[model samples]
Target: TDDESSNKCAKTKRRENVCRVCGNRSGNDEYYSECCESDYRYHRCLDLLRNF
Candidate 1:
């Protein structure tokens, strides 16, 4: 028996209401490409990392 790891993360038949970018729960949209405007993780964290 052989298996393909490439198919591991492939989208299934079920509607996984999750963001594909940051792997966070969907906010205002579903299967979003980039970070959503309301995504706190990106907006909140971006400010802190600017100090580097």
Candidate 2:
């Protein structure tokens, strides 16, 4: 399940929320691309890493 989706991570990059950018950005913005996937894990760890 999770592993099957991991390949999406290297699919490509995406733009979102004004000038901000991300890898898929939760794949919610993939409407702009077909093989796009979100980088939710990065942000999740980021918040944890920074204690945010």
Clashes of each: 0, 1
Look at candidate 1 and tell me the lDDT of residue 21.
Answer: 32
For residues 1-52, could you state the per-residue lDDT of candidate 2 as single tens digits?
4453665444333222211222233344533233333455444423432421
Query: Quick one: best lDDT, which candidate?
Result: 2
For each candidate in turn, the TM-score is 0.23, 0.24
Evaluated at residue 32, the lDDT of candidate 1 is 48
lDDT (C-alpha) at residue 16 in model 1: 21
Any runs in candidate 1 off by more than 4 Å, and if so which?
A: 1-38
Q: Once superposed on the true structure, which residue ranges of model 2 sit more than 4 Å away at CA? A: 1-38
How far residue 6's Cα lies from its native spot in candidate 1, in Å, is 14
In Å, residue 34's CA in model 2 sits off its true spot by 22
